[PDB]
Amino acid sequence: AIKKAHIEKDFIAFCSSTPDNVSWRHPTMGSVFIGRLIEHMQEYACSCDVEEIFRKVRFSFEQPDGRAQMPTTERVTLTRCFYLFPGH
């Protein structure tokens, strides 16, 4: 027997900046979005779901400096909380 499934579901995209806008990278330190994402994933994977972690990453960028950017979550069809359960 056949059953119907949503063609597009359980996706989340996380982009380094808002549309039209630059994303910054340091020659020795790497991309700031990437570095910031790793730091937050290392700290918060144990206690927060991915949507929550991405929000925290966005917050860390809130105060703009000389190299400003605002990471954006896109086209979200996560129907549940995605916890990484690091160690499990």
């Binding site: 499934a5 949503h6 063609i7 597009e8 579901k9 359980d10 996706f11 989340i12 995209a13 996380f14 982009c15 380094s16 900046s17 808002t18 549309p19 039209d20 806008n21 630059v22 994303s23 990278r25 340091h26 020659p27 020795t28 330190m29 790497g30 991309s31 979005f33 990437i34 570095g35 994402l37 790793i38 994933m41 290392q42 700290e43 918060y44 994977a45 144990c46 206690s47 779901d49 991915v50 703009p64 400003a68 950017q69 605002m70 896109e74 086209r75 996560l78 549940r80 909380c81 995605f82 916890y83 990484l84 359960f85 690091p86 160690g87 499990h88």
Partner: protein, 173 residues
Amino acid sequence: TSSGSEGNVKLCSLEEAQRIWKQKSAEIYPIMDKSSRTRLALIICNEEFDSIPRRTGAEVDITGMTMLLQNLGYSVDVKKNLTASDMTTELEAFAHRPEHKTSDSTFLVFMSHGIREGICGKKHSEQVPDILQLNAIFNMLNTKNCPSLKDKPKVIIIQAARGDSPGVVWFKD
């Protein structure tokens, strides 16, 4: 200790895991058994280009993301300096991997130069564009083109500019 498989990623304890499973009912994605699951992740990073500036520091990004995804339990494929056509071919191959059947989730990481329209391939120039669109990434990984990842979280991470603007406006206090 950072000497374990999870490295610098803070561990979720048994009491912490049960707290997560108690606060939320049936609103969490199920994770497969650690002993049998075959988690896959793909990193595509473009550093060396034909006509646009070299992405110095990209190696730091590759190292950081590869180690992180491994720490989280994913087997990581790293592909470098691809055209948009090559990225499409690589994504199609990734969607066809048998391991997704015995996996509970996946991560896709794209790192390159970017414009408003999408992500730059190695051959990109203003005269002859070489762009992979975010829409194409979703399409290649959806239920039609990747049935093995049905009901499973698919996380797409993109490091790339989305235009030329500084992303700021002025205001007075």
